[PDB]
């Protein structure tokens, strides 16, 4: 008959296929009170083709198990855990009801000749209900999955369930869903409802209080059986024996946050315009102090349509994605940096797109300074100025024109890409800046050399051929070391070619014989110069420029970073940097002085690239491996509560090409003299 | 106590929270036979509060449900279902066992105070084996899935399973799962493990053997509660009387048929080479039977650089979706012909790959016989041929190169695109066919006003804008009547003004008083020419024109195709062969010929273009619905056993573009007379 049961109390069993078990479990339920009950069964027995059956049935629900639990494995592999636990989705008392009388029965069950073992506990889970701002410390396991309830309190409108690990694995998927029964709480049903994130040691889910009924969630904690889908293999975790007794046990701490309000949104949105409007404030007010003592446009036309061309196929991709799996709450999908993703509209993560308006604004700005010098010059030559025509460089602002514009559609491309980072998208946070670097070191070439233009598209295509080399070099070559000798090998003699004939030789010429020259120049000690040379700053420069690129190469050779685009942005940038300081060298060896304008302007540009580099270094998400595996990076915000390192690598770095853009543009003005020049 | 019940017996019962029902069922199962046991359940008794609780235990496996089943749908609407059935997963006897006695028990429990009535009834499934080539009909229900089992035969590699329902709705799913226990019938766990395919009423799963130990699979039929994922809403279908009665009865066909053998890809493949090399084998022999009797370098890189930013953003994603989802078993992803898709490798649908090869091989022809003409011209300035100085219209082959090289890529892109068609995808089918339009177009005005060129950006930020356009109102623009109002002002605007100012008046200049010009064209009746002009032929033609783009504007205006890029390339297609076909009718208008060879390409290119534009409107898939609704459209293979109508849309298209290149190449070739032409 019935066996009136205790909680908290563990029977121990034997059921065949004539003797089945059991077990009545009375209980009451108060108002404005939630009790969740928790069923534990193990059985010691060890014959899965007899396992114990176990059934569960409550007044509007039934649920079952077998005991070993089995779960199928990648490659046939296959797994049996003795010890299964489940809590019983909950109905919890309101005043409509009063003290709610709930009765539930388990069945204990089994086919075996003579029975298997097993033993039962069934408790009270004292807390069940999270708090507000209180972690929680509990294990779950992948037959023994769990889950817990929070109420939105009543000022509370969006919340943050942060869970932490101190171990990667096993693979695990904290789930949200509403508190109506049934839970899905097994490895097969936690992803079709709710929003999920996979996790090895960290996630972090956003949660709007409108967007469940009854401000209420169970937030659902279910462990893999396997580690594939977090990077990792079949049985990666090792904890327990291997001799009948199989165990995934993980410790997790959870704790529900409440999120910023809007008057964070508020701040940081003023912060973000006015830093940089503080620098048109602060330009347009000491040029008009100092002032009291076209063949350009196709330039336009050039940048914006290889933006279009380029900035096209990444909109409509995160279009489709900030939405195609927004509404599935697969969380997988976009490698935010889920502790800083502060969402605005549709945007998940809208301070990443905010922190991208310093491109834009500085960009602008950088046009509207080299539009005045274009009308102020334009203007010397119409009243022929001598001062305009035979005094100074000859001077050519197509091409800063395009610096400005680039850095205007770097910070549109940074954005749209931050609207769904992954891994269909990643050169399009830092691909243009390649462009941009580009169109600086040509600016320094046709500076001292200016009868040499070629801005058809051989001055493109090169950015077209940069694209190929990194894109494909991340897809077909990740860290595959064939890949990078060979990159290695066309790094290093691009740099000694190009450096041998562009910078040495003062030539824009692109045969076969570079190499031949690149032999005439410096096999030449018993030809051209001894150990104390005439002419030796060129030459020196030339030397540090090949072993710093050397270095670099070398360096990508051993450490082989997977983040390939990161790495092509490191030889831009190192490029630019050095040579940029081979120039203003030349220009100090020779007569010439550095005006105070371009000084500070070259210290900034040394301070914001260090603070930017710095920013750059910290990895806040991937692409490179899984969610989970990205995830495991992630920080909360470092600025105002709502900036991470890498929108302050977008500040800075907007910054620091701001500065080089203006170093370039101002470094020659000490030239007030008539044209004796080299 | 225990009821030995009998199969194929129809039992009610009554059962209340003192009563609990229990009914063993013995059966044997043979060697070499598989007996799967069916499980009916309804329940007369509607008071949802105190369901009937269906426990079956089997050796190896308990499972357990409510009747009335409980479906929640978007919105919060709830279904009941009375009527619940399975399957239990079955263990096939083997030779190791001989006949196995089976024992299964069926508890019926409630916790009524006066009990609820149910039936019950448990069948043995005469025909859950599905034999090759078979049609199987039967019915399912979102709360009595189905499943059936297929063990593949000794010779056949590779199946595919194809399902057809003749009504749209409901909504289903159709997975195919190895055939170890369990079964996931359930809509919460169907998406879990095998592959799977949304259908309204029609799908299609191709499988080797390969990925199947013991070279048997479950097919398994699974009806969803509501048909929000394939494109209808809370109930669109209609079958009962909605009075406590419920049932979404879904008829469905199952046929498992072998797929093709190698001999069949290795035939397709010489087929689609040899058809396109026999176009090299013709060109070249009646070349030489008739002989019987570099400014263009840039011009190359000037398409390929814009190939390249156009064709790296999608390699990158199909590469992905190809993968990110191939091991994920979604078939939901890529919107293939489900019906003819012929895997190789990793490319689900290698058909679709191949039938592009006829765009790479003959832009190559057409560029080797653009070079051939290039080279002959450039030899005969080098003799001083009296007949290449001051003989015929001055030629410039810049152009024809870049038609070759965008025919080619027209090509790569297109097969790009079909490695995974979806909506993040959809102009690379055919956007790169405006570029070559538009190359032809300029390349029918420069052939009689040649000093006119500005080939560096503005022939391609043209392209830019137009890619814009049609990416833009194909997703923001879908259907919404004030998009197609405003894309049709805009078309019939440029049509007039672009008309009357360049083909009409012969300029090309891109002002703001064009429209004031084409105020002083025609409304000149009492200025100009009476009802019967002089030079009416030219007045003619462009008032024709101007009606046929007034007609697609206003057909695109009524039926508003969702499909925008089909129309584009449509308004492109009619307006290069419109302004070919002007072109054609005044050369003969004046005493100029139509020499034999751009006779016989004039009438190629009439009649492919008649061919592929009967095969470009063969609807075989789609990105604008669902997965379900795109399979709709699915058609069996119409070529060769492998190629369906797209296959044949991209051989056809190939040869039209060929054709009408050769048109353009070949036209004024009667000019053999010293200029004195208008
Ligand atoms: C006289 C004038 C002086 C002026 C000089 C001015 C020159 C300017 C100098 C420096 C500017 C360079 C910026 C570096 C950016 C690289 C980024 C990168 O590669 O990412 C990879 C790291 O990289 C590696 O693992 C090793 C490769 C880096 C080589 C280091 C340069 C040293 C070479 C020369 C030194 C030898 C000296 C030569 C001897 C003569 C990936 O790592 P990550 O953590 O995944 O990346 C984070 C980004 N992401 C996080 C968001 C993923
Ligand atoms: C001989 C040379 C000189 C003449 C040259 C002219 C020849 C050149 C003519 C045509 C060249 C191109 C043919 C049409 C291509 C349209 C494609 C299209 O829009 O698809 C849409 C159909 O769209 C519609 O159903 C309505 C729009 C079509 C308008 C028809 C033009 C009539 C205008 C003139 C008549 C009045 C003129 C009055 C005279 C004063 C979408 O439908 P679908 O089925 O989804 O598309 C299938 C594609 N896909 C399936 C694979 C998805
Ligand atoms: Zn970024
Ligand atoms: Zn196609």
Redesign the interface.
Known sequence: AARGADFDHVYSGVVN?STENIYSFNYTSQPDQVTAVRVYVNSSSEN????V???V?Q????????VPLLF?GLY?RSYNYQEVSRTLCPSEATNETGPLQQ?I?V?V?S?APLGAQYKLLVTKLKHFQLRTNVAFHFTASPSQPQYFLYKFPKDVDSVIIKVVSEMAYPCSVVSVQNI?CPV?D????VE??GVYQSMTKKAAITLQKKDF?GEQFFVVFVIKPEDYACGGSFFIQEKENQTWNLQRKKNLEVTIVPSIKESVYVKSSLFSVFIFLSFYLGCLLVGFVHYLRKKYK?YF??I???A???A???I??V??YQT?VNVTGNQDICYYNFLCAHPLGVLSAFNNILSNLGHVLLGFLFLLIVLRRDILHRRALEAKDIFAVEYGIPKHFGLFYAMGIALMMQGVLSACYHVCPN??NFQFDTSFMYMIAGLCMLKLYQTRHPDINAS???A??SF??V??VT?LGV?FGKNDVWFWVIFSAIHVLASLALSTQIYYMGRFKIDLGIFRRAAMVFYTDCIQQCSRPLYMDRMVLLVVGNLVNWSFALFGLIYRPRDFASYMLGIFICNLLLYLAFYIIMKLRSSEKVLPVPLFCIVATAVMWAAALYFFFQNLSSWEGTPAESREKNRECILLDFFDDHDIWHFLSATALFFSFLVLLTLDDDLDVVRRDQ
Chains 1, 2 share one sequence.
Do not use: C, G
């Open positions: 296929l899965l083709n007899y396992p059956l176990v059934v049935r007044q509007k629900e039934v649920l079952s198990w077998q199928q046939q009765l029965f069945d069950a086919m109506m899905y097994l490895d097969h049903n079709f409802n009924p196709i036309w050039n914006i349509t290889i279009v061309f380029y096209l196929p990444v409509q991709l279009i489709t195609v891994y269909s058809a598209y051989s493109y295509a077209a051929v694209i190929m894109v897809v």
